[PDB]
Amino acid sequence: FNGLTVLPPLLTDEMIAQYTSALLAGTITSGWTFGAG
Amino acid sequence: GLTGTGVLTKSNKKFLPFQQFGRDIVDTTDAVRDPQTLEILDITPCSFGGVSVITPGTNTSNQVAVLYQGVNCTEVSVAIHADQLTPTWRVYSTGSNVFQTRAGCLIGAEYVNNSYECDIPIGAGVCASYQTQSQSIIAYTMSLGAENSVAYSNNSIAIPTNFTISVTTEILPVSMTKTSVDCTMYICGDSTECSNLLLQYGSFCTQLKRALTGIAVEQDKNTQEVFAQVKQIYKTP
Amino acid sequence: PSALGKLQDVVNHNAQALNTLVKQLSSKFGAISSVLNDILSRLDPPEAEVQIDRLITGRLQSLQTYVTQQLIRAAEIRASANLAATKMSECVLGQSKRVDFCGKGYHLMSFPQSAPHGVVFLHVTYVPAQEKNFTTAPAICHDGKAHFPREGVFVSNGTHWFVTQRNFYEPQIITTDNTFVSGNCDVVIGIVNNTVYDP
Amino acid sequence: CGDSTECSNLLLQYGSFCTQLKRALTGIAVEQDKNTQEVFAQVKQIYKTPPIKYFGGFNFSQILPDPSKPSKRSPIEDLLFNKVTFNGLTVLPPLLTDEMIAQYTSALLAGTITSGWTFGAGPALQIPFPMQMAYRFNGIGVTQNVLYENQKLIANQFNSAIGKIQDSLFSTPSALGKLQDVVNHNAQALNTLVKQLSSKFGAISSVLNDILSRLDPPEAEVQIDRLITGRLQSLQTYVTQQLIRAAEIRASANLAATKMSECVLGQSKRV
Amino acid sequence: GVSVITPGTNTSNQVAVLYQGVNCTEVSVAIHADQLTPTWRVYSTGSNVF
Amino acid sequence: FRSSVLHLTQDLFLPFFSNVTWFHANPVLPFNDGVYFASTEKSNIIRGWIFGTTLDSKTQSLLIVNNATNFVIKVCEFQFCNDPFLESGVYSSANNCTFEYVSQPFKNLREFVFKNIDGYFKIYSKHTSALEPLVDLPIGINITRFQTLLDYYVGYLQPRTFLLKYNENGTITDAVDCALD
Amino acid sequence: PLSETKCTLKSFTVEKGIYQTSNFRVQPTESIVRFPNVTNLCPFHEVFNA
């Protein structure tokens, strides 16, 4: 455009998916213990 | 010498012998006197307001309704009979279904005494819908829900005997897009005289760039504080 | 199909703002021509400073309005992000007792799901059903002493008396291990007489 | 401009600021309705109180609606209601009337007094008021026999404490200044906006009906531009202030909805 | 836009240059000629292009 | 006309608690953009006022004479021999007379306020509060001195800011001077 | 009015709902001027009817 630019995000969608999968795995394998230590 | 426009009616004001015209708190003219009758006449602005259109959807029908916000329908009929109304379209001149509401006058819908759930909000507790009744647009008063009565007593109690599992969803936004502005190509665009003239305005460009940079930096920490909570990557067996 | 409109509204608003900003360049703020390449490269008088100043002021005002609206929207975005982080931390990493915070009903557990510029939570709750009417009583007296239930509530099927929890029907025999003694029988209003088991 | 054609044609060269202004105003107007919707519309059943009103000694007549008066409001609600008091400007009526809000409040009160916390999380199970108060006393670490041994004293204390709120609200008219400040600010903003029309931003005359219909010279666009710019700046400032106040009101409404959901539909342990 | 990366003036004076949103082929074409706007091209000798 | 409103007005007024001058029951006094006049004598002998810039029949001058029933105004180059007294007893000659006017006929205080601006000469009066307007002339003479002919008071106006209060009927009830406290 | 809604939305299709399109006004019908009861005329009879 006329001096307009869009900046890409820092974290990609794959990293967010990995974080979500790790959260789900921790929840289904340890319950609430990983949340408190 | 005092020019204007409005409706002239008789009022009950009591002007002093040396008074000519009065003003209200906002310093607007609201009363004048006849130079040949010396009577008191009040001035009121002529009717005006917005127009709203109601449609059940172009994929279902082409019938619509018109709503004149904040006006009595008698003045609307008087203006339709003459040529004083500003909108030139009067296709609903033959429609006898005229109803008056607290939000205005509705033309093109019939009012019913029944009550249903609100589909299209109109105002003042009135909503409209498209029913088969031969299909047409109807108007009604919205209902809050079905009534219920509890069997209260001095020695009564209810205990459940079964249960069920339910799953619900919830959606929440986290961040938005990041944008940057050059502040020079947008205003001048390869023009030396324009740049020399803009150099005399100060540093608004710096403030704008700083605000945009701050927004762009905050957009990343918004996601960082939400998703980056755990420190280890767990795996399933 | 109208499920995720909340995430689409932000994109629509940003696109509309950008389109309006790029469209504002085709206007004339009291000058001989609207577009910049029309006079910034075709003008001949050197006193056209008064003509260029109009466009300069107009574009500066447009940029200022755009930045103000962006800040106003970013504030709400930050608020929503903080709310989402709080809900995540309080519903996913534990079991909350706050009513209607992690779903409708008695919360058990939650599961997060990723989404473009957002997040989705799946809440599992507990809902009772199939309730029945019963007769209740505050306490009972066997040896002229008032017996209060330790956990649960006293119910009667019409002929006998039992004690059960309030969230699930499960009759049990009233024994000394389920009740405690406190005071006499002449003080409680609405008390009834019944025997108490003692193994 | 007002009734003018030359000023209207000159205004077209500035773009679409009025489109953005109308869009922002429509967004605020739509949000003002959902603010009340998310707060008062949390139930799907309209519960009613039984004909008899004996609840073991507790008296709730001061909070229940009165069928004698035409407005179905509570005695206290009447006291609260009786102490809280043209060119291109229009005020839009709300969607829900006061009677619907009163009906919602009455249904909430009826559900609370007839089922306690069960209608909040599941089916509305009937339970007498004393048992409910006994379980509420047990929920804070006190044995339930304390209520069965002092029900009369506790009911007398409750009835005496309820009556004092009426006198406190009757003797203090400033207790509700928070709701009056918003109306005062809105009225003052409207008055300032309607007063700004009587200024001359570097022109020969201030008011619109003075030069827009009398202009003697044939070149006057430079005179109309001043008023156009001034009125546009005034409208922009007004819209910005309205947006800020709307954001504050949204925050307050979210806080009020959280308070309602966490204090009325259950018992909270938050200090 | 152009961004400069620095590890700190107290540790070293080496820096890096980042050209946002452009292919490096056009950048090399502009550097071989005199079409690039920034007059400083000291990093043209560095073969570490990524 | 205004009803039940408080209007802030900036104009020439007499400051509250000012230093007025008291005379018995007659030199020439200046005209500093306004002169306040008051009297309380029943069947007063002092009647009429003299206005002008030189007062020697060399330039146009203003003269007014008040009586028991009506009020007349004559503007001409009158020549006062020594001092006016009350007509031959006031002036002796007249030349190039321009205009002449007449008015409609009609405690015991009597107040007057004189003001000339933009070529208009208007006065105020009230008998026994605010003063009603009474007349106005489109006379464009230059007034610089003031003279009276026969206890009275003289006060000069100053540009001040005042807050006025109007009742339902549209009459001024109370006023507040922004300064002095 | 449906065409006006389509023009406002700039689309040949429109979903269900309510939309604001324009405003209505009542136009004046005639003009009225007022001036004092009488008029003091000039005595031209003293010059012409001499």
mmCIF file with all atom_site columns, N, CA and C in Angstrom, chain F residues 73-121:
data_model
loop_
_atom_site.group_PDB
_atom_site.id
_atom_site.type_symbol
_atom_site.label_atom_id
_atom_site.label_alt_id
_atom_site.label_comp_id
_atom_site.label_asym_id
_atom_site.label_entity_id
_atom_site.label_seq_id
_atom_site.pdbx_PDB_ins_code
_atom_site.Cartn_x
_atom_site.Cartn_y
_atom_site.Cartn_z
_atom_site.occupancy
_atom_site.B_iso_or_equiv
_atom_site.pdbx_formal_charge
_atom_site.auth_seq_id
_atom_site.auth_comp_id
_atom_site.auth_asym_id
_atom_site.auth_atom_id
_atom_site.pdbx_PDB_model_num
ATOM 1   N N  . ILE F 1 73  ? -37.248 67.068 24.202 1.00 0.00 ? 73  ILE F N  1
ATOM 2   C CA . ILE F 1 73  ? -35.826 67.029 23.885 1.00 0.00 ? 73  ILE F CA 1
ATOM 3   C C  . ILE F 1 73  ? -35.565 67.925 22.684 1.00 0.00 ? 73  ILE F C  1
ATOM 4   N N  . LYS F 1 74  ? -34.539 68.765 22.798 1.00 0.00 ? 74  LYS F N  1
ATOM 5   C CA . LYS F 1 74  ? -34.126 69.641 21.713 1.00 0.00 ? 74  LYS F CA 1
ATOM 6   C C  . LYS F 1 74  ? -32.610 69.626 21.599 1.00 0.00 ? 74  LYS F C  1
ATOM 7   N N  . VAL F 1 75  ? -32.122 69.403 20.382 1.00 0.00 ? 75  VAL F N  1
ATOM 8   C CA . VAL F 1 75  ? -30.688 69.364 20.108 1.00 0.00 ? 75  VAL F CA 1
ATOM 9   C C  . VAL F 1 75  ? -30.355 70.475 19.125 1.00 0.00 ? 75  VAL F C  1
ATOM 10  N N  . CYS F 1 76  ? -29.563 71.447 19.575 1.00 0.00 ? 76  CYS F N  1
ATOM 11  C CA . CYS F 1 76  ? -29.187 72.583 18.746 1.00 0.00 ? 76  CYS F CA 1
ATOM 12  C C  . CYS F 1 76  ? -27.996 73.280 19.388 1.00 0.00 ? 76  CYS F C  1
ATOM 13  N N  . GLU F 1 77  ? -27.475 74.286 18.686 1.00 0.00 ? 77  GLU F N  1
ATOM 14  C CA . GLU F 1 77  ? -26.320 75.035 19.164 1.00 0.00 ? 77  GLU F CA 1
ATOM 15  C C  . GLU F 1 77  ? -26.742 76.141 20.124 1.00 0.00 ? 77  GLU F C  1
ATOM 16  N N  . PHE F 1 78  ? -27.166 75.762 21.327 1.00 0.00 ? 78  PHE F N  1
ATOM 17  C CA . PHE F 1 78  ? -27.579 76.748 22.316 1.00 0.00 ? 78  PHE F CA 1
ATOM 18  C C  . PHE F 1 78  ? -26.362 77.432 22.930 1.00 0.00 ? 78  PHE F C  1
ATOM 19  N N  . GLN F 1 79  ? -26.529 78.703 23.289 1.00 0.00 ? 79  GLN F N  1
ATOM 20  C CA . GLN F 1 79  ? -25.457 79.511 23.862 1.00 0.00 ? 79  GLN F CA 1
ATOM 21  C C  . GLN F 1 79  ? -25.824 79.877 25.297 1.00 0.00 ? 79  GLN F C  1
ATOM 22  N N  . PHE F 1 80  ? -25.114 79.292 26.255 1.00 0.00 ? 80  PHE F N  1
ATOM 23  C CA . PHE F 1 80  ? -25.321 79.631 27.656 1.00 0.00 ? 80  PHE F CA 1
ATOM 24  C C  . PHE F 1 80  ? -24.438 80.810 28.049 1.00 0.00 ? 80  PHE F C  1
ATOM 25  N N  . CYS F 1 81  ? -25.083 81.903 28.467 1.00 0.00 ? 81  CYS F N  1
ATOM 26  C CA . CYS F 1 81  ? -24.355 83.133 28.767 1.00 0.00 ? 81  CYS F CA 1
ATOM 27  C C  . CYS F 1 81  ? -23.380 82.936 29.923 1.00 0.00 ? 81  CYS F C  1
ATOM 28  N N  . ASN F 1 82  ? -23.903 82.664 31.118 1.00 0.00 ? 82  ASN F N  1
ATOM 29  C CA . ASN F 1 82  ? -23.047 82.413 32.272 1.00 0.00 ? 82  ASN F CA 1
ATOM 30  C C  . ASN F 1 82  ? -23.313 81.037 32.870 1.00 0.00 ? 82  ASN F C  1
ATOM 31  N N  . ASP F 1 83  ? -24.566 80.778 33.250 1.00 0.00 ? 83  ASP F N  1
ATOM 32  C CA . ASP F 1 83  ? -24.943 79.526 33.891 1.00 0.00 ? 83  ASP F CA 1
ATOM 33  C C  . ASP F 1 83  ? -26.429 79.284 33.699 1.00 0.00 ? 83  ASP F C  1
ATOM 34  N N  . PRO F 1 84  ? -26.864 78.042 33.502 1.00 0.00 ? 84  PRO F N  1
ATOM 35  C CA . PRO F 1 84  ? -28.298 77.780 33.344 1.00 0.00 ? 84  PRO F CA 1
ATOM 36  C C  . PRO F 1 84  ? -29.033 77.869 34.670 1.00 0.00 ? 84  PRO F C  1
ATOM 37  N N  . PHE F 1 85  ? -30.280 78.330 34.592 1.00 0.00 ? 85  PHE F N  1
ATOM 38  C CA . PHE F 1 85  ? -31.121 78.483 35.770 1.00 0.00 ? 85  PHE F CA 1
ATOM 39  C C  . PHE F 1 85  ? -32.581 78.413 35.352 1.00 0.00 ? 85  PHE F C  1
ATOM 40  N N  . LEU F 1 86  ? -33.373 77.697 36.145 1.00 0.00 ? 86  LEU F N  1
ATOM 41  C CA . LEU F 1 86  ? -34.797 77.542 35.868 1.00 0.00 ? 86  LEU F CA 1
ATOM 42  C C  . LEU F 1 86  ? -35.604 77.505 37.163 1.00 0.00 ? 86  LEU F C  1
ATOM 43  N N  . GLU F 1 87  ? -36.224 78.597 26.840 1.00 0.00 ? 87  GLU F N  1
ATOM 44  C CA . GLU F 1 87  ? -36.272 79.574 27.921 1.00 0.00 ? 87  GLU F CA 1
ATOM 45  C C  . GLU F 1 87  ? -35.044 80.477 27.888 1.00 0.00 ? 87  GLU F C  1
ATOM 46  N N  . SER F 1 88  ? -35.264 81.779 28.082 1.00 0.00 ? 88  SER F N  1
ATOM 47  C CA . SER F 1 88  ? -34.159 82.733 28.063 1.00 0.00 ? 88  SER F CA 1
ATOM 48  C C  . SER F 1 88  ? -33.220 82.556 29.247 1.00 0.00 ? 88  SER F C  1
ATOM 49  N N  . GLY F 1 89  ? -33.699 81.982 30.350 1.00 0.00 ? 89  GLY F N  1
ATOM 50  C CA . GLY F 1 89  ? -32.864 81.787 31.521 1.00 0.00 ? 89  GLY F CA 1
ATOM 51  C C  . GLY F 1 89  ? -31.815 80.706 31.396 1.00 0.00 ? 89  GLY F C  1
ATOM 52  N N  . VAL F 1 90  ? -31.815 79.956 30.292 1.00 0.00 ? 90  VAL F N  1
ATOM 53  C CA . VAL F 1 90  ? -30.841 78.902 30.056 1.00 0.00 ? 90  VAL F CA 1
ATOM 54  C C  . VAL F 1 90  ? -29.937 79.218 28.872 1.00 0.00 ? 90  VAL F C  1
ATOM 55  N N  . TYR F 1 91  ? -30.520 79.542 27.719 1.00 0.00 ? 91  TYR F N  1
ATOM 56  C CA . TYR F 1 91  ? -29.752 79.857 26.525 1.00 0.00 ? 91  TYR F CA 1
ATOM 57  C C  . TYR F 1 91  ? -30.188 81.212 25.992 1.00 0.00 ? 91  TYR F C  1
ATOM 58  N N  . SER F 1 92  ? -29.418 81.724 25.030 1.00 0.00 ? 92  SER F N  1
ATOM 59  C CA . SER F 1 92  ? -29.693 83.018 24.424 1.00 0.00 ? 92  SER F CA 1
ATOM 60  C C  . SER F 1 92  ? -29.806 82.987 22.907 1.00 0.00 ? 92  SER F C  1
ATOM 61  N N  . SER F 1 93  ? -29.148 82.047 22.233 1.00 0.00 ? 93  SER F N  1
ATOM 62  C CA . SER F 1 93  ? -29.176 81.981 20.779 1.00 0.00 ? 93  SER F CA 1
ATOM 63  C C  . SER F 1 93  ? -29.246 80.528 20.333 1.00 0.00 ? 93  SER F C  1
ATOM 64  N N  . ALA F 1 94  ? -29.653 80.332 19.080 1.00 0.00 ? 94  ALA F N  1
ATOM 65  C CA . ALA F 1 94  ? -29.751 79.010 18.483 1.00 0.00 ? 94  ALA F CA 1
ATOM 66  C C  . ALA F 1 94  ? -29.511 79.122 16.986 1.00 0.00 ? 94  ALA F C  1
ATOM 67  N N  . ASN F 1 95  ? -28.825 78.128 16.427 1.00 0.00 ? 95  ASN F N  1
ATOM 68  C CA . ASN F 1 95  ? -28.487 78.137 15.011 1.00 0.00 ? 95  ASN F CA 1
ATOM 69  C C  . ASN F 1 95  ? -28.237 76.711 14.546 1.00 0.00 ? 95  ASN F C  1
ATOM 70  N N  . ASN F 1 96  ? -28.710 76.412 13.335 1.00 0.00 ? 96  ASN F N  1
ATOM 71  C CA . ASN F 1 96  ? -28.566 75.088 12.726 1.00 0.00 ? 96  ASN F CA 1
ATOM 72  C C  . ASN F 1 96  ? -29.160 73.999 13.616 1.00 0.00 ? 96  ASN F C  1
ATOM 73  N N  . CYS F 1 97  ? -30.408 74.201 14.033 1.00 0.00 ? 97  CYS F N  1
ATOM 74  C CA . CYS F 1 97  ? -31.095 73.209 14.850 1.00 0.00 ? 97  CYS F CA 1
ATOM 75  C C  . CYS F 1 97  ? -31.472 72.010 13.989 1.00 0.00 ? 97  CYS F C  1
ATOM 76  N N  . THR F 1 98  ? -31.131 70.811 14.461 1.00 0.00 ? 98  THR F N  1
ATOM 77  C CA . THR F 1 98  ? -31.293 69.607 13.653 1.00 0.00 ? 98  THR F CA 1
ATOM 78  C C  . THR F 1 98  ? -32.559 68.828 13.976 1.00 0.00 ? 98  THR F C  1
ATOM 79  N N  . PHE F 1 99  ? -32.753 68.422 15.228 1.00 0.00 ? 99  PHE F N  1
ATOM 80  C CA . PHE F 1 99  ? -33.879 67.567 15.571 1.00 0.00 ? 99  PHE F CA 1
ATOM 81  C C  . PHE F 1 99  ? -34.550 68.072 16.841 1.00 0.00 ? 99  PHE F C  1
ATOM 82  N N  . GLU F 1 100 ? -35.768 67.583 17.065 1.00 0.00 ? 100 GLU F N  1
ATOM 83  C CA . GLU F 1 100 ? -36.519 67.856 18.281 1.00 0.00 ? 100 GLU F CA 1
ATOM 84  C C  . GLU F 1 100 ? -37.502 66.716 18.499 1.00 0.00 ? 100 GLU F C  1
ATOM 85  N N  . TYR F 1 101 ? -37.668 66.332 19.763 1.00 0.00 ? 101 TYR F N  1
ATOM 86  C CA . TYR F 1 101 ? -38.472 65.166 20.092 1.00 0.00 ? 101 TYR F CA 1
ATOM 87  C C  . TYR F 1 101 ? -39.388 65.486 21.264 1.00 0.00 ? 101 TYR F C  1
ATOM 88  N N  . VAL F 1 102 ? -40.345 64.586 21.497 1.00 0.00 ? 102 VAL F N  1
ATOM 89  C CA . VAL F 1 102 ? -41.279 64.693 22.611 1.00 0.00 ? 102 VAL F CA 1
ATOM 90  C C  . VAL F 1 102 ? -41.613 63.282 23.075 1.00 0.00 ? 102 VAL F C  1
ATOM 91  N N  . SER F 1 103 ? -41.938 63.153 24.361 1.00 0.00 ? 103 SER F N  1
ATOM 92  C CA . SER F 1 103 ? -42.235 61.860 24.957 1.00 0.00 ? 103 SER F CA 1
ATOM 93  C C  . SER F 1 103 ? -43.707 61.808 25.346 1.00 0.00 ? 103 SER F C  1
ATOM 94  N N  . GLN F 1 104 ? -44.183 60.599 25.608 1.00 0.00 ? 104 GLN F N  1
ATOM 95  C CA . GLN F 1 104 ? -45.571 60.422 26.007 1.00 0.00 ? 104 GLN F CA 1
ATOM 96  C C  . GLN F 1 104 ? -45.765 60.913 27.441 1.00 0.00 ? 104 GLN F C  1
ATOM 97  N N  . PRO F 1 105 ? -46.905 61.521 27.752 1.00 0.00 ? 105 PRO F N  1
ATOM 98  C CA . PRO F 1 105 ? -47.137 62.019 29.110 1.00 0.00 ? 105 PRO F CA 1
ATOM 99  C C  . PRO F 1 105 ? -47.397 60.878 30.088 1.00 0.00 ? 105 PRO F C  1
ATOM 100 N N  . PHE F 1 106 ? -47.504 61.252 31.359 1.00 0.00 ? 106 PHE F N  1
ATOM 101 C CA . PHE F 1 106 ? -47.745 60.287 32.426 1.00 0.00 ? 106 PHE F CA 1
ATOM 102 C C  . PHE F 1 106 ? -48.491 60.937 33.586 1.00 0.00 ? 106 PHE F C  1
ATOM 103 N N  . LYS F 1 107 ? -40.950 55.225 49.500 1.00 0.00 ? 107 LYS F N  1
ATOM 104 C CA . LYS F 1 107 ? -40.089 56.376 49.259 1.00 0.00 ? 107 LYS F CA 1
ATOM 105 C C  . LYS F 1 107 ? -40.392 57.012 47.906 1.00 0.00 ? 107 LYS F C  1
ATOM 106 N N  . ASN F 1 108 ? -39.621 58.039 47.550 1.00 0.00 ? 108 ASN F N  1
ATOM 107 C CA . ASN F 1 108 ? -39.830 58.750 46.296 1.00 0.00 ? 108 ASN F CA 1
ATOM 108 C C  . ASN F 1 108 ? -38.520 58.919 45.537 1.00 0.00 ? 108 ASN F C  1
ATOM 109 N N  . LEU F 1 109 ? -37.743 57.844 45.427 1.00 0.00 ? 109 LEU F N  1
ATOM 110 C CA . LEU F 1 109 ? -36.473 57.904 44.720 1.00 0.00 ? 109 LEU F CA 1
ATOM 111 C C  . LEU F 1 109 ? -36.691 58.074 43.221 1.00 0.00 ? 109 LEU F C  1
ATOM 112 N N  . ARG F 1 110 ? -35.697 58.664 42.562 1.00 0.00 ? 110 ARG F N  1
ATOM 113 C CA . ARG F 1 110 ? -35.734 58.888 41.120 1.00 0.00 ? 110 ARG F CA 1
ATOM 114 C C  . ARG F 1 110 ? -34.324 58.722 40.578 1.00 0.00 ? 110 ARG F C  1
ATOM 115 N N  . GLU F 1 111 ? -34.129 57.732 39.710 1.00 0.00 ? 111 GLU F N  1
ATOM 116 C CA . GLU F 1 111 ? -32.809 57.368 39.220 1.00 0.00 ? 111 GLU F CA 1
ATOM 117 C C  . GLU F 1 111 ? -32.739 57.550 37.712 1.00 0.00 ? 111 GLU F C  1
ATOM 118 N N  . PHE F 1 112 ? -31.526 57.796 37.218 1.00 0.00 ? 112 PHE F N  1
ATOM 119 C CA . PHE F 1 112 ? -31.278 57.957 35.794 1.00 0.00 ? 112 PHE F CA 1
ATOM 120 C C  . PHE F 1 112 ? -29.896 57.426 35.454 1.00 0.00 ? 112 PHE F C  1
ATOM 121 N N  . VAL F 1 113 ? -29.774 56.857 34.255 1.00 0.00 ? 113 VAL F N  1
ATOM 122 C CA . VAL F 1 113 ? -28.508 56.362 33.734 1.00 0.00 ? 113 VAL F CA 1
ATOM 123 C C  . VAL F 1 113 ? -28.355 56.852 32.302 1.00 0.00 ? 113 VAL F C  1
ATOM 124 N N  . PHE F 1 114 ? -27.226 57.496 32.019 1.00 0.00 ? 114 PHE F N  1
ATOM 125 C CA . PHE F 1 114 ? -26.948 58.074 30.710 1.00 0.00 ? 114 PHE F CA 1
ATOM 126 C C  . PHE F 1 114 ? -25.851 57.270 30.029 1.00 0.00 ? 114 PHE F C  1
ATOM 127 N N  . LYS F 1 115 ? -26.045 56.971 28.747 1.00 0.00 ? 115 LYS F N  1
ATOM 128 C CA . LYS F 1 115 ? -25.079 56.202 27.975 1.00 0.00 ? 115 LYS F CA 1
ATOM 129 C C  . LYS F 1 115 ? -25.179 56.587 26.507 1.00 0.00 ? 115 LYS F C  1
ATOM 130 N N  . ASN F 1 116 ? -24.023 56.742 25.865 1.00 0.00 ? 116 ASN F N  1
ATOM 131 C CA . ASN F 1 116 ? -23.936 57.059 24.446 1.00 0.00 ? 116 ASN F CA 1
ATOM 132 C C  . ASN F 1 116 ? -22.874 56.177 23.805 1.00 0.00 ? 116 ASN F C  1
ATOM 133 N N  . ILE F 1 117 ? -23.274 55.403 22.801 1.00 0.00 ? 117 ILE F N  1
ATOM 134 C CA . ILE F 1 117 ? -22.364 54.470 22.145 1.00 0.00 ? 117 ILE F CA 1
ATOM 135 C C  . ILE F 1 117 ? -22.894 54.184 20.746 1.00 0.00 ? 117 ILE F C  1
ATOM 136 N N  . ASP F 1 118 ? -21.976 54.155 19.775 1.00 0.00 ? 118 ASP F N  1
ATOM 137 C CA . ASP F 1 118 ? -22.294 53.823 18.384 1.00 0.00 ? 118 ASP F CA 1
ATOM 138 C C  . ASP F 1 118 ? -23.329 54.776 17.793 1.00 0.00 ? 118 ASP F C  1
ATOM 139 N N  . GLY F 1 119 ? -23.302 56.034 18.226 1.00 0.00 ? 119 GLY F N  1
ATOM 140 C CA . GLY F 1 119 ? -24.212 57.031 17.698 1.00 0.00 ? 119 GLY F CA 1
ATOM 141 C C  . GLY F 1 119 ? -25.632 56.946 18.207 1.00 0.00 ? 119 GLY F C  1
ATOM 142 N N  . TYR F 1 120 ? -25.853 56.348 19.373 1.00 0.00 ? 120 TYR F N  1
ATOM 143 C CA . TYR F 1 120 ? -27.176 56.250 19.969 1.00 0.00 ? 120 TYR F CA 1
ATOM 144 C C  . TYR F 1 120 ? -27.133 56.740 21.410 1.00 0.00 ? 120 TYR F C  1
ATOM 145 N N  . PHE F 1 121 ? -28.120 57.548 21.782 1.00 0.00 ? 121 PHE F N  1
ATOM 146 C CA . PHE F 1 121 ? -28.223 58.111 23.121 1.00 0.00 ? 121 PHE F CA 1
ATOM 147 C C  . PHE F 1 121 ? -29.483 57.585 23.793 1.00 0.00 ? 121 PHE F C  1
#
